[PDB]
Design a protein around this motif. Structure first.
Motif, PDB file in Angstrom:
ATOM      1  N   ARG A 285       0.822  -1.205   0.000  1.00  0.00           N
ATOM      2  CA  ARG A 285       0.000   0.000   0.000  1.00  0.00           C
ATOM      3  C   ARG A 285       0.858   1.258   0.000  1.00  0.00           C
ATOM      4  N   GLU A 286       0.430   2.263  -0.756  1.00  0.00           N
ATOM      5  CA  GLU A 286       1.132   3.539  -0.806  1.00  0.00           C
ATOM      6  C   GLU A 286       1.005   4.291   0.515  1.00  0.00           C
ATOM      7  N   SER A 287       0.028   3.892   1.324  1.00  0.00           N
ATOM      8  CA  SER A 287      -0.236   4.552   2.596  1.00  0.00           C
ATOM      9  C   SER A 287       0.768   4.159   3.676  1.00  0.00           C
ATOM     10  N   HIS A 288       1.575   3.140   3.404  1.00  0.00           N
ATOM     11  CA  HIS A 288       2.529   2.650   4.393  1.00  0.00           C
ATOM     12  C   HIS A 288       3.739   3.571   4.507  1.00  0.00           C
ATOM     13  N   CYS A 289       4.474   3.428   5.605  1.00  0.00           N
ATOM     14  CA  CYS A 289       5.665   4.232   5.849  1.00  0.00           C
ATOM     15  C   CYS A 289       6.897   3.576   5.237  1.00  0.00           C
ATOM     16  N   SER A 290       7.533   4.276   4.302  1.00  0.00           N
ATOM     17  CA  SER A 290       8.702   3.750   3.603  1.00  0.00           C
ATOM     18  C   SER A 290       9.886   3.542   4.545  1.00  0.00           C
ATOM     19  N   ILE A 291       9.950   4.349   5.598  1.00  0.00           N
ATOM     20  CA  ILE A 291      11.012   4.230   6.589  1.00  0.00           C
ATOM     21  C   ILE A 291      10.904   2.901   7.327  1.00  0.00           C
ATOM     22  N   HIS A 292       9.673   2.507   7.638  1.00  0.00           N
ATOM     23  CA  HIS A 292       9.420   1.239   8.311  1.00  0.00           C
ATOM     24  C   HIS A 292       9.739   0.070   7.390  1.00  0.00           C
ATOM     25  N   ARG A 293       9.443   0.239   6.105  1.00  0.00           N
ATOM     26  CA  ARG A 293       9.728  -0.790   5.112  1.00  0.00           C
ATOM     27  C   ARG A 293      11.228  -1.038   4.996  1.00  0.00           C
ATOM     28  N   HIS A 294      11.998   0.043   4.921  1.00  0.00           N
ATOM     29  CA  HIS A 294      13.451  -0.052   4.849  1.00  0.00           C
ATOM     30  C   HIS A 294      14.034  -0.676   6.114  1.00  0.00           C
ATOM     31  N   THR A 295      13.409  -0.386   7.251  1.00  0.00           N
ATOM     32  CA  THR A 295      13.859  -0.920   8.530  1.00  0.00           C
ATOM     33  C   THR A 295      13.648  -2.431   8.587  1.00  0.00           C
ATOM     34  N   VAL A 296      12.544  -2.893   8.009  1.00  0.00           N
ATOM     35  CA  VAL A 296      12.228  -4.317   7.986  1.00  0.00           C
ATOM     36  C   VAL A 296      13.147  -5.083   7.035  1.00  0.00           C
ATOM     37  N   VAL A 297      13.427  -4.494   5.877  1.00  0.00           N
ATOM     38  CA  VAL A 297      14.318  -5.111   4.898  1.00  0.00           C
ATOM     39  C   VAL A 297      15.707  -5.340   5.484  1.00  0.00           C
ATOM     40  N   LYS A 298      16.249  -4.312   6.129  1.00  0.00           N
ATOM     41  CA  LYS A 298      17.555  -4.414   6.769  1.00  0.00           C
ATOM     42  C   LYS A 298      17.499  -5.383   7.943  1.00  0.00           C
ATOM     43  N   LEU A 299      16.340  -5.445   8.590  1.00  0.00           N
ATOM     44  CA  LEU A 299      16.135  -6.330   9.729  1.00  0.00           C
ATOM     45  C   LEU A 299      16.213  -7.790   9.297  1.00  0.00           C
ATOM     46  N   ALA A 300      15.590  -8.102   8.165  1.00  0.00           N
ATOM     47  CA  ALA A 300      15.637  -9.448   7.609  1.00  0.00           C
ATOM     48  C   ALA A 300      17.052  -9.791   7.156  1.00  0.00           C
ATOM     49  N   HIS A 301      17.771  -8.781   6.678  1.00  0.00           N
ATOM     50  CA  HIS A 301      19.149  -8.953   6.238  1.00  0.00           C
ATOM     51  C   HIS A 301      20.085  -9.169   7.421  1.00  0.00           C
ATOM     52  N   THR A 302      19.886  -8.381   8.473  1.00  0.00           N
ATOM     53  CA  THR A 302      20.712  -8.456   9.674  1.00  0.00           C
ATOM     54  C   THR A 302      20.651  -9.842  10.311  1.00  0.00           C
ATOM     55  N   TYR A 303      19.454 -10.417  10.353  1.00  0.00           N
ATOM     56  CA  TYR A 303      19.263 -11.729  10.958  1.00  0.00           C
ATOM     57  C   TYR A 303      19.278 -12.840   9.911  1.00  0.00           C
ATOM     58  N   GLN A 304      19.613 -12.472   8.675  1.00  0.00           N
ATOM     59  CA  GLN A 304      19.703 -13.406   7.549  1.00  0.00           C
ATOM     60  C   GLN A 304      18.514 -14.355   7.462  1.00  0.00           C
ATOM     61  N   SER A 305      17.313 -13.795   7.541  1.00  0.00           N
ATOM     62  CA  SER A 305      16.092 -14.584   7.476  1.00  0.00           C
ATOM     63  C   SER A 305      15.204 -14.088   6.341  1.00  0.00           C
ATOM     64  N   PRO A 306      14.430 -14.999   5.730  1.00  0.00           N
ATOM     65  CA  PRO A 306      13.521 -14.652   4.631  1.00  0.00           C
ATOM     66  C   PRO A 306      12.535 -13.545   4.992  1.00  0.00           C
ATOM     67  N   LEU A 307      12.238 -12.685   4.025  1.00  0.00           N
ATOM     68  CA  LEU A 307      11.271 -11.611   4.213  1.00  0.00           C
ATOM     69  C   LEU A 307      10.120 -11.757   3.226  1.00  0.00           C
TER      70      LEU A 307
END
Length: 154
Positions: A91-113
């Motif tokens: 959704r365009e209504s979502h926060c892009s900052i939160h999205r970027h935080t989640v992507v890096k979060l999945a990367h940091t813990y090396q887990s599927p997103l």
């Protein structure tokens, strides 16, 4: 039997996801436990095969709660027994900052997103069917396939 732990702050979305997974049964008996956050308050009774962190990308609290909960997970879980599921990213209504935080979060813990709008049943049904298959792998119910190909498979 296979057991999945859904970690999320939205009780409604978790139960709907839990229902979708329990629908259309398979070979193994599937069990679903829900948790608002980690760690569990020392009820902590057996036995978990897979932890799925459901992240609401419209909620900064859901983001923070996920961040904090990850600190109490044994590193052995992040070798395929942990999966990230983000909701609202489509959704365009979502926060892009939160999205970027989640992507890096999945990367940091090396887990599927994974991405899915849980409010949409058609999308949720397909996502649930995949999660069931992921759970069976994590439970060692898929011969020749361990919960280690998951980062590559997902």
């Amino acid at each position: 039997t296979a057991t999945i732990l859904l970690v999320g702050t939205e009780d409604a979305l978790l139960q709907q996801l839990a229902d979708s997974m329990l629908k259309e049964d398979c070979a193994s008996e599937l069990k679903v436990h829900l948790a608002k956050s980690l760690p569990l308050p020392s009820v902590n009774r057996p036995r978990i095969d897979l932890i799925v962190f459901v992240v609401n990308l419209h909620s900064k609290y859901s983001l923070q709660n996920t961040e904090e909960s990850l600190r109490h997970v044994d590193a052995s879980f992040f070798l395929g027994k942990v999966c990230f599921l983000a909701t609202g990213a489509g959704r365009e209504s979502h926060c892009s900052i939160h999205r970027h935080t989640v992507v890096k979060l999945a990367h940091t813990y090396q887990s599927p997103l994974l991405y899915c709008d849980l409010e949409v049943e058609g999308f949720r049904a397909t996502m649930a069917q995949r999660l069931v298959r992921v759970l069976q792998i994590c439970a060692g119910h898929v011969p020749g396939v361990s919960a280690l190909n998951l980062l590559s498979l997902l």
